[PDB]
Structures are given as structure tokens and as C-alpha cells.
From a paper:
A previous study suggested that another small molecule involved in signaling, the inorganic polyphosphate hexametaphosphate (hexaMP), binds the MglA–SspA complex. However, we found that hexaMP did not compete with ppGpp binding to MglA–SspA. Moreover, cocrystallization of MglA–SspA with hexaMP revealed no electron density for this small molecule anywhere in the structure.
Author numbering:
A (entry chain A): 2 to 204
B (entry chain C): 0 to 194
Amino acid sequence: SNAMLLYTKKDDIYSDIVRMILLIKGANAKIVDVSKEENSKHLEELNIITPNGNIPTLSTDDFAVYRLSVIIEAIEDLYPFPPMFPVFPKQRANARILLEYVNKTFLQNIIKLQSPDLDEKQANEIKMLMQRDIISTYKKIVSEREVNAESNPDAQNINVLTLIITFVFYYFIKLKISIPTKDKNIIKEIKELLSEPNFIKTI
Amino acid sequence: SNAMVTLYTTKYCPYSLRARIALAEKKMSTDIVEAGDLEPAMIKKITPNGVFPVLMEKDYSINNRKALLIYIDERFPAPSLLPNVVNERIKIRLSLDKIDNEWYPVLDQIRKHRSDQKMLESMFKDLKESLLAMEKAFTGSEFFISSGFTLADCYIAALIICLEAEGFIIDDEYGAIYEYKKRLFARDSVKKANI
């Protein structure tokens, strides 16, 4: 039927994000942890349908798409409800830019830190490079969300870049990286932000 | 003035040729202006970072390479520059990325390393193989991987332009490709951009 197959690996922040969007959509989808040796059968497959056993991969009968943006957009086509993006073509683009930043800065770096051959000095730099631009980042993500929410109070769409970041905090927490902030309610926001139901359900 | 938008562009730059090809496609009343033919003071006024294709209208200014084109297609919706069939559109959105990422770099590397003729001799031999084996793999379709004109075609149109201006030309010895390029340059979009 709706044979949507999502290929994943445990603790792979991309997978975790696609898995929580699919949840929100209410899309039915056979998640597949390739880390698990039971699915040796699917992993054999994956390396047929993607140039480098790419993860995550969203496979259906018609296509096998990888790469976060493509995927996130792909899901928007497939399950329109509820909306993932703003509606005003200016704000849509801004988010597309921001998502591309949050990615080259935290998302892929988070993945470098998981490699077991990283040179002790390498990461300390990575982590701290991350600590620098995270608060400013969060602050940007909010501002934009205040805009798009207010430009249309009737639209009632979700802010994908808020979801995405909830994960960047959850991995900051997973990797024992500190979130440098005194600001009272930022931490209140953060805590509430990790306390949204579907996030828990994703973990 | 009423030039709803204006596109500032550099010469021999695909990213700008991509944008001009799609703005034409959108029958849009836009002013187009060049760089190099601007005051070193204003160039910094509009785009403070020397990125160069920059589209600006009344209350917005944009140049993010990987996002600009998607924006034109969304801002001025008709005619649509993506497929209608979900699945098709989904995989065009992927071929776009693969293009911007695995193919456009071959361009820079044909330029940045071009002041040397022994390297070129080999690179042109590669671009030869890489296409040789796909010129078969695609056929029986009017434009690229669709029925109608996609952003994907804008991407490729512009890319070819720059490469054949590096000396890399497509011959009778590729096939459905040469004529797909012939068709590409047949379009009033691609033609006002090539001259």
C-alpha cells in the first residue's frame, strides 16, 4: 500500500528529525534502523538504491531520496497536512537559508563528532565552535517564528526550524556540550521546547 | 522605478545565467544590470558579500545560491517551473541538488585550473566519459526528466553555456543530448541569456 520505507541509523540526528516530522504528518512509514543487524537484508538493498548507502533515505516504490532538505520538501508534497513551511515566498526562502545554516554548522558537525577516529583537539574545537553560534542561532529562529506566525494568525502552520533545533539541543545534551546561557526564560523556553509531546514520542 | 525586481549579474557565471533564464520564463517586468559596470561603492550597498546573482525588489534582497531559483518560481508562480506529478517533482528536487553539487564543481575546476593545458586535456576526457555513458541512459523525453520545462533545465542550460565558453563543446557524438541541447537553445528563455 503506502509502502513508505525510511532507512535510518540509531542516534543519527538526521533520522531522528525525519522520524519526528513523519510522526507529525501522521504518515505511515516503515522505519528501518540499519545499525541493527536484523536488517542486514535492507542494508544490502539500500546500497543498491543510493550512491553511498545514504542515511537517512526515504524510499518509496517510485523513488529513493536522500539529503535532509530534499526529504523535508518531499514530505511536504506527500503529506500536505499540516503545513511545515510558512506561506509567504519571502519567509519560506529565509527559512530555507536558515535551515542550510543550522545544517552546515551543527547538523553535519554533530556527525563528525560521532566518528571514532577524531583527533582529541579536533572536536573540542568543533564543540566550542558550536557553542558560539548556537544562542544567536536560537534567537534568529524565534524572531522569524514570531514574524511568520503574526503575518498569518489563521494559517496555523508549524515551524520546522524550531523542531530541527529542539534536536540540536537534545544532542548538545547527548554529547555533554554545555548550552552557554544565563537568560532565565531562554532556558525555560528550551526546557518546554524539549517537553513537547511528539518530541518525546520520537525518543 | 517600476522594475518590480532587478537582477544584478556577473558575466560567465552560471548562477546568474540560471536566474536570467527563469525570469524570462516568468514573463516578468524586471530590470537587469551588470557588475563591473557599477560603482565599487554601490556594489557593496546592494550585496555586501560579493555573492553574485542578486535579486532585489522593494522590501527584500536575496542571493543565496542554493535558494534563489526556488524563490523566483515561488514568488512569480505562473508558469510553474516544477513538475505537477508529486513523484516527478520530488526527484527533480533531488536531481537539482546532485547537479549543484557534483557537476557545477567540475566547472570551477575547469577554470581555476585552466591556465594549464595538460590537466584540461584529461578533464575534458572525463566530462566526455561521464556524459558518454548517460547520453544513452536518457532519451524519449522532450526536456530533462519531465514533460515540460523544469528548473532542472535552467540549471543545465546555464551550465553548458559556461562550459562551452571554456572550450568544452557538445558534438554530434553524444546523441539525444546534442539535440536536447539544441532544443534547450531553441527556447526564447535560453537565447536572450546566451548573447
